[PDB]
Every structure is written in C-alpha cells, then in structure tokens.
Amino acid sequence: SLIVTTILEEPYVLFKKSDKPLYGNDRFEGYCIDLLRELSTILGFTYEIRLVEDGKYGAQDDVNGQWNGMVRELIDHKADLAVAPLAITYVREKVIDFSKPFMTLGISILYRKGTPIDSADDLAKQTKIEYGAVEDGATMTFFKKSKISTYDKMWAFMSSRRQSVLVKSNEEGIQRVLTSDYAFLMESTTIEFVTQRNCNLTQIGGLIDSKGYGVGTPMGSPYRDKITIAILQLQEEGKLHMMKEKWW
Amino acid sequence: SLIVTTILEEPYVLFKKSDKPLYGNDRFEGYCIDLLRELSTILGFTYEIRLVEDGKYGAQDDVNGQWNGMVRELIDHKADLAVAPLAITYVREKVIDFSKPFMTLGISILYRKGTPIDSADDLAKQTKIEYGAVEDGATMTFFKKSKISTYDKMWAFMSSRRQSVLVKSNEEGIQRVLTSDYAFLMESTTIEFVTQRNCNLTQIGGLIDSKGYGVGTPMGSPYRDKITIAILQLQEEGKLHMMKEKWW
Ligand SMILES: C=C(C)[C@H]1CN[C@H](C(=O)O)[C@H]1CC(=O)O
Ligand SMILES: C=C(C)[C@H]1CN[C@H](C(=O)O)[C@H]1CC(=O)O
Ligand SMILES: [Cl-]
Ligand code: NA
Ligand code: NA
C-alpha cells in the first residue's frame, strides 16, 4: 500500500460524520478523497491516508532552508503521494514532482458585497481596511516575490503587520472577513466554496495569477507519470468536474 | 541547437509581415514565438524553428495506430521541442511528454449572436443548425470518446456528416460560422481571439471540458522538467499573462 499524505481542508479533505466509530481511510471524505479513490480505481494501487503531522503544506525556512509539511514528507520518502489542494509552484517543483493539475485556479480577494473596493489596487492604496493571507503559503509567497508595484505595496503592508494580518489557515482568514473589516487574499477555488455558503461575501476582482493543484510525489518517483495519465483520463471523461460539482 | 517544431495558427504563430523576405527564425512571431524566446533565455539554448511538414498537431490513425503531426516528429526524434497550441491529452501523454501547461482552456461553442441557442444540448437536440469541429483534433477526439449522452449524440451527428461539417482548420470553421447557419466547436482561447475581432460572434455556453496547452518533448527527454520549471517561473513573474495580453 502507498502512504498518502494529506491535510484537513474543506471541501478537499474532512472527517466523515457517522453515529458510529470510523477507522482507516473510511474516516475521511471530500474532493481529494474521491480523487484518490478514482486514481486507485484507474491505477490499481491500495493506500493508507495519513494526515501530515505538522499540519503544513510545504515551504522552506528563511534561515536554514529546511522544508516542512507534506513536501518534506515526500522529500524524505515518508509518503508516496501527497493529495491535497497543494499548489504547483516553482520552488516546490524544484524539490518534489507534481502531476499535471487536477484543478486550475488563482489568487483573488474574499471580501464583503456592496463596497467601493473593486480590485487589489483599491486595497493597496489604503490602510483602513486590513488585508492579508495565510502565512507561508503559495499566496503569501506570490506577494513576497512580486516586482509588480501594486503587489509589492501589498507585501510591504502585510509584512509590516505579520502578527496582525497574516493568518494560519483559510478558516481563520474567512472568520476575520466575517467579524472585522478585512479582505482576505485567498485561492479562488476556496473562495468559490465560501461564497456559495455566505451570501454576504464575494470575490473581488478577478484572478491575480494562475496556478494548478497537483498530486505530489518524491522526485524521481515512477508514480508521477502514472498519476498524470490517470488525472488526464478523469478530466476527459468529465469525472473531475462531477467531483467539483459534488463538493462545491 | 534545438530543433523546434511548430505550426501556423493565429495568434500563437504567424508569418511576420514585411516587404523584405525574411529568413530562418525571423519569419515567425506570435504568442508561442515569444514563449520560445523566453524559454530560450532562461534555459540558455539556441534553436531552429521548423513548421511541421504534414501541417498536423498529432492524432493516431484508428486503423493502424500510426501517429502524425508534431507528436510524430517528437516520437521519431526529428524535433527536440514542440511549441504550439498543442493540447495536453491522455492519448498524447502516453507517447510524448508535456510540460506543465502554459495556458488553460476548454472546448466551447462559437456562434452568431441573438439566437435562443444557449448550450451544447440546444445544438444536439436539433439538426437545422449544423455544427462541427476541426477533424482529428483534440476537440473532435473528446466527442468521439465521450459517454455523456449529449456529446455522444453530437458525435453521431458530426461523424455521419464528416464530409460536410468537419473542417481542416479553425479558420475554415470560423468562416463557416460567418457564412452559413453553423456553430463551431473550438478551443476557448481561440474563441476569445475571434470574438474580440468579430462583434457579431460570441461564445455559446461555458467550457465543455478543461485542458492545457504544454510544450511537447520526446518521452524521456531531459528538457521536460527544465521546461516545466521555466514555465512556472514565467507564470509566477507574470510574463505568461503579459504575453497573452500582447497577442490577444
Ligand atoms: C490551505 C492553504 C494553507 C494552502 C492551500 N493551497 C495553498 C498552498 O499550496 O500553499 C495554501 C493556501 C494559500 O496560500 O492561499
Ligand atoms: C488549431 C487546432 C487544429 C488544434 C489546436 N489545439 C487542438 C489540438 O491540440 O488538437 C486543435 C484544435 C481543436 O481540436 O479544436
Ligand atoms: Cl508533468
Ligand atoms: Na520536480
Ligand atoms: Na509521456
């Protein structure tokens, strides 16, 4: 059986609800869990789902350059696959492999309806309305590395207020939008999940960038090409879209 | 020096307009030529552009399984890279490698404005308005392989009318839309190019599927992972977006 690392994140992975105790893979459900099952159906492997111990996706430390999260598990061969809303990025692609994307997306803004704010530029040029991102994720890294004036300005604002405006999870960011005057820079797929359930919330502007989620494997893994082919098959037979419709 | 296979397709690749006759790489421009130049700078290779002799992208003969087009050139090692609007598909991925996508898109419908036609199902349930696609391309292959009722029905229609509703190029399909009662099934990125320039035309419905275009390499090519990393770099620094804006 392959060891599959993943992390709790609605509606990709959550704990299945039951009146009775649940065990093993049966404990989990969500889009990535359905995806994993479908990949299993196509490729013929068995697997054990394990939540990443440190609760992180995968970033490199500023000082020592140590990797953490699901990415680190793959690097050290403590897992065979990572199946999660894990963004395919330049810095990650240099240390692990990714399948072709099972979802395509971009950074955008979660905020409230009915305001004058219509774009990232509107946020960048003011300070009354606070804004931020999940600390150390692909979204924050985008802003940290941008040489675009607007996003450059936004990173200056965020980094000078790290403790106060950067959050530890999508959920935290979402709650802050719901309970303070705050705009949350977050991935469009997850924004769409939220706005479908909170009628007062909306995406502001369009996508700021473009990226995919891919299944991660340790570099040199034989499963990378197999998983890519299975994802393409699922895409083409319309299964990925059915799964999205199911969970969103 | 790398041999790069490509094909004329506006605005991805076109003959540069000039009084003086141009030679070698100077003949060509377009989104894909910009992409090639950007890749060349990051990875440090020189190259010769060659238009694929048979003028095809790459399909399998369904009697004998032989491949054609740019896919065949890569398989036979007659080219090092294919840089074109070449869709990443299940059947092609089994025989060549693709970089991560530099553009994401989907099949949709090009038609005239002001009709009640709102979806593929609206077309499928009638026969007065003809419809078709480029013969043997990724769009056609999608319909040919689909088990979805609406799409299977559309495939029955198109395949039985093979001689009259399937075309040899996007250009031919577009002229069909302009000059008769016909809806063209084609890739959304190309539709966007067309609708921006013909105000009487529009996209009907949304995307029917999802796919990317990627750089092709012969299977096992070392350039695959380097090209993927270069694409991610171009995407993250906003260049791919500027390239699309330039050419669309
Ligand atoms: C759930 C979060 C922490 C993850 C999910 N995808 C991004 C990633 O792969 O880093 C992170 C979100 C973000 O940065 O907006
Ligand atoms: C220009 C055409 C012939 C190509 C472009 N991409 C698709 C491909 O890679 O097959 C084809 C279009 C299509 O099938 O609608
Ligand atoms: Cl890949
Ligand atoms: Na890699
Ligand atoms: Na391949």
- Provide the domain limits for residue B142: 106-210
- Strand A130-132, strand A182-187: pairing: parallel
Tell whether A145 is within 8 A of chain B (Cβ).
yes
> Are A63 and A157 found together in one domain?
no
Residues B224, A65: Cα–Cα separation, whole Å: 26
CA of B93, nearest ligand number: 5
B85 is in an annotated binding site: yes
Residues A76, B52: Cα–Cα separation, whole Å: 43
Segments of B56-175 assigned E as strands: 81-82, 96-98, 103-105, 107-112, 130-132
> Are A70 and A145 found together in one domain?
no
Segments of A16-116 assigned E as strands: 28-29, 47-51, 81-82, 96-98, 103-105, 107-112
Helix then strand then coil, % of chain B, to nearest 5: 40, 20, 40
What would the two tokens of residue B101 be?
A: 């996508």
What would the two tokens of residue A46 be?
A: 């068995």
> Are B205 and B215 found together in one domain?
no
Handedness of CA B235, B214, B37, B77 (dihedral sign): positive
> Does B89 contact ligand 2 (Cβ within 6 A)?
no
Give the CATH number, domain containing residue B91. 3.40.190.10
Q: Dump the DSSP string for B143-165.
A: HHH--SHHHHHHHHHHHHTHHHH
> Are A114 and A100 found together in one domain?
no
Residues A63, A75: Cα–Cα separation, whole Å: 19
Residues A25, A174: Cα–Cα separation, whole Å: 28
Instruction: Say if residues B203 and B119 touch (Cβ distance below 8 Å).
Output: no
> Are B21 and B91 found together in one domain?
yes
> Are A3 and A101 found together in one domain?
yes
Exposure class string for B100-124: b at 16+ Cβ within 10 A, else e: bbbbbbbbbbbbbeeeebeebebbb
Q: Which residues surround ligand 4, an ion (CB under 5 A)?
A: A 93, 97, 219
Chain B residues touching A100 at Cβ < 8 A = 88, 93, 98, 100-101, 212
Resolution attained, angstroms: 1.9
Tell me which H or E stretch contains B229.
Answer: helix B223-236
Instruction: Say if residues B83 and B48 touch (Cβ distance below 8 Å).
Output: no
CA B35 vs CA A201, B32, B146: distances in Å: 38, 5, 32
Query: What residues are paired with A5 via a beta bridge?
Result: A50, A82
Residues A131, A157: Cα–Cα separation, whole Å: 9
Tell whether B195 is within 8 A of chain A (Cβ).
no
What would the two tokens of residue A59 be?
A: 């970033």
Tell whether B232 is within 8 A of chain A (Cβ).
yes
Instruction: Say if residues B135 and B168 touch (Cβ distance below 8 Å).
Output: yes
| CA nearest to B83, candidates B8, B4, B25, B16 | B4
Cβ–Cβ below 8 Å for B212 and A100 = yes
Method: X-ray
Residues A85, A9: Cα–Cα separation, whole Å: 8
Q: Which residues surround ligand 5, an ion (CB under 5 A)?
A: B 93, 97, 219
Domain count, chain B: 2
